[PDB]
Amino acid sequence: DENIVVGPKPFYPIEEGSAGTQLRKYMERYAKLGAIAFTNAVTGVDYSYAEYLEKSCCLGKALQNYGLVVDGRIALCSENCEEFFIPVIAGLFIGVGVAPTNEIYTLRELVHSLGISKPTIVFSSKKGLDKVITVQKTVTTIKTIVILDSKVDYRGYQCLDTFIKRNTPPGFQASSFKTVEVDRKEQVALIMNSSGSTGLPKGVQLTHENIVTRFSHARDPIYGNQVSPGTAVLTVVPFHHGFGMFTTLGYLICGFRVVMLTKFDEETFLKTLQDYKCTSVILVPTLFAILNKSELLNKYDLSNLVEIASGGAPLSKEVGEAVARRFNLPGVRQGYGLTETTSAIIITPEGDDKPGASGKVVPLFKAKVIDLDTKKSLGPNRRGEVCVKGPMLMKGYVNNPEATKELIDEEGWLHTGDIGYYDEEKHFFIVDRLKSLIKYKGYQVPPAELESVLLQHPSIFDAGVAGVPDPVAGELPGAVVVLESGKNMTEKEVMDYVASQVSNAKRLRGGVRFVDEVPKGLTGKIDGRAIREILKKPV
Numbered sequence: 283d284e285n286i287v288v289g290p291k292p293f294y295p296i297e298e299g300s301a302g303t304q305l306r307k308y309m310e311r312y313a314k315l316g317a318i319a320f321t322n323a324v325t326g327v328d329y330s331y332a333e334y335l336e337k338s339c340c341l342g343k344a345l346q347n348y349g350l351v352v353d354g355r356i357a358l359c360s361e362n363c364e365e366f367f368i369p370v371i372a373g374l375f376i377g378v379g380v381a382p383t384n385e386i387y388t389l390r391e392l393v394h395s396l397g398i399s400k401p402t403i404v405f406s407s408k409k410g411l412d413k414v415i416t417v418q419k420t421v422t423t424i425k426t427i428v429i430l431d432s433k434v435d436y437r438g439y440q441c442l443d444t445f446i447k448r449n450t451p452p453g454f455q456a457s458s459f460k461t462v463e464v465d466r467k468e469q470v471a472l473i474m475n476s477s478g479s480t481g482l483p484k485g486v487q488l489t490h491e492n493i494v495t496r497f498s499h500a501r502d503p504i505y506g507n508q509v510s511p512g513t514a515v516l517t518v519v520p521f522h523h524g525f526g527m528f529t530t531l532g533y534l535i536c537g538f539r540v541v542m543l544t545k546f547d548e549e550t551f552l553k554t555l556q557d558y559k560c561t562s563v564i565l566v567p568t569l570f571a572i573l574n575k576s577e578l579l580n581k582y583d584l585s586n587l588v589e590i591a592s593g594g595a596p597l598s599k600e601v602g603e604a605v606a607r608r609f610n611l612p613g614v615r616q617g618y619g620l621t622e623t624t625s626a627i628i629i630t631p632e633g634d635d636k637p638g639a640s641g642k643v644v645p646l647f648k649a650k651v652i653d654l655d656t657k658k659s660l661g662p663n664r665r666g667e668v669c670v671k672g673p674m675l676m677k678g679y680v681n682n683p684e685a686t687k688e689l690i691d692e693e694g695w696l697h698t699g700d701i702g703y704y705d706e707e708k709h710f711f712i713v714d715r716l717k718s719l720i721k722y723k724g725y726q727v728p729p730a731e732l733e734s735v736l737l738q739h740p741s742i743f744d745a746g747v748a749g750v751p752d753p754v755a756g757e758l759p760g761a762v763v764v765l766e767s768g769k770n771m772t773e774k775e776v777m778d779y780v781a782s783q784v785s786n787a788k789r790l791r792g793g794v795r796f797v798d799e800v801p802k803g804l805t806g807k808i809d810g811r812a813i814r815e816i817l818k819k820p821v
């Protein structure tokens with residue numbers, strides 16, 4: 283079947299050893315070099331590779347001394363902090379599965395998530411502690427809570443350093459610690475949760491094989507960023523999520539200084555780029571809005587920035603092109619993936635550009651686009667459901683065989699739930715989620731196409747589009763809009779503006795509501811249910 287698109291061979295073959303073994307090898311190299319691994323952009327606190335490696339080894343030993351066995355479970359519950367990856371790496375080193383969560387989860391989300399992954403120990407931020415204590419009342423198998431981002435014991439709980447000290451012999455040498463080899467294709471490494479699900483979070487099981495595949499991509503000269511220890515990268519994405527998890531772990535294999543930024547005011551954003559000489563960043567779409575509007579770019583030395591990427595959610599082609607132009611860059615790089623594919627499986631290849639494209643199939647992967655009804659493969663320039671296959675496919679959901687069966691078909695293809703197409707040169711374009719398409723008469727209108735038009739308006743800061751029920755037409759496209767400060771548009775002004783830019787079918791017949799915040803998930807995807815609820819309310 284010539285409709286299947288097959289990715290190339292990676293420049294760097296997948297290395298032998300577990301994901302823990304590989305991380306240890308590279309971290310040790312950068313440790314001896316004296317490089318910095320993590321920097322908190324706002325405080326300027328650094329962890330060297332040497333310190334991060336030492337603590338990760340010491341925590342690995344501590345978890346073994348505590349009694350955790352291969353295929354045990356720990357969790358994190360934390361907003362981004364520079365300590366976040368210590369329990370992750372320790373788990374990978376010893377073959378204990380790690381379930382990351384964020385403090386920003388609701389209690390309903392967190393109780394469900396941790397109830398599925400069943401961690402023995404939770405590494406909680408100070409901020410997340412109250413939620414973890416509450417969850418423990420239901421998930422009563424959580425034995426121990428350790429405070430991740432405190433140097434001292436906190437509210438009666440051991441901090442990370444205390445837990446390590448209490449579970450390792452005095453004078454324990456990290457250099458002596460051995461990574462634990464595992465059955466790479468079978469051994470769960472991480473239990474992850476997607477963002478923007480319409481239901482409660484499922485536990486996505488990712489293996490060591492999944493992760494070491496990512497390590498090849500991450501440092502690939504075409505599909506990643508080349509090893510360059512000391513080079514700084516800015517990161518803004520949530521660490522608990524696959525997007526932040528596998529970009530960050532990849533950056534550690536690359537030897538980069540991971541500059542973690544948690545505040546997105548333009549001054550701090552720009553000052554961070556300048557002060558740490560950041561050479562690249564992967565943004566989410568809302569951060570592009572800040573950069574397109576900024577009147578301050580000229581005040582900062584931004585000359586070190588040679589790459590801007592995007593992922594997680596649809597990016598307006600025109601907004602991306604404007605921002606790339608401001609920075610005098612050829613274009614915005616992009617990656618597209620799902621929690622269930624570990625990381626990005628379509629990435630813009632260096633040297634092989636195409637306006638508006640999401641990129642090309644990554645090494646070791648295959649992709650196809652199927653007809654929504656027949657499920658048969660399609661040629662180029664035909665919209666259908668993107669499906670993918672390759673060694674980053676998850677092992678399956680935790681204790682949910684039905685959901686696994688629905689996602690990964692009898693022929694081993696993962697059905698992404700996304701609409702897209704590929705062109706004659708095999709560039710893929712991801713349009714939107716199938717579930718988001720607005721059923722206006724016989725049309726299937728992608729909200730992202732309307733959102734792009736809205737975002738391009740200089741008075742519109744943010745927008746989200748969804749379908750308003752309608753007896754005659756099925757669904758009418760409607761929009762929720764956040765206006766830029768000091769600007770005003772009426773509903774009619776927005777509707778007329780959109781009508782001037784789109785087909786008749788795409789008009790905002792469902793109307794426009796103005797809000798302070800567009801409802802979205804943790805990595806920028808529009809919350810359709812929430813938008814529909816807002817549109818339902820009378821003005």
Ligand SMILES: Nc1ncnc2c1ncn2[C@@H]1O[C@H](COS(=O)(=O)NC(=O)c2csc(-c3nc4ccc(O)cc4s3)n2)[C@@H](O)[C@H]1O
Nearest residue numbers: 476477524525591593594595596617618619620621625626
């Ligand atoms: N680039 C994109 N364009 C449009 N939509 C995109 C998208 N990426 C994810 N999505 C949407 O998120 C859904 C998946 O949501 S999810 O489960 O929460 N997981 C993800 O969103 C997810 C998991 S890993 C990951 C990426 N890793 C990267 C590494 C480098 C890089 O440059 C870019 C990326 S994006 N994204 C997709 O089905 C799709 O609807």
Ligand SMILES: [Cl-]
Nearest residue numbers: 478803805807
């Ligand atoms: Cl999201």
Ligand SMILES: [Cl-]
Nearest residue numbers: 477478803804
């Ligand atoms: Cl979310």
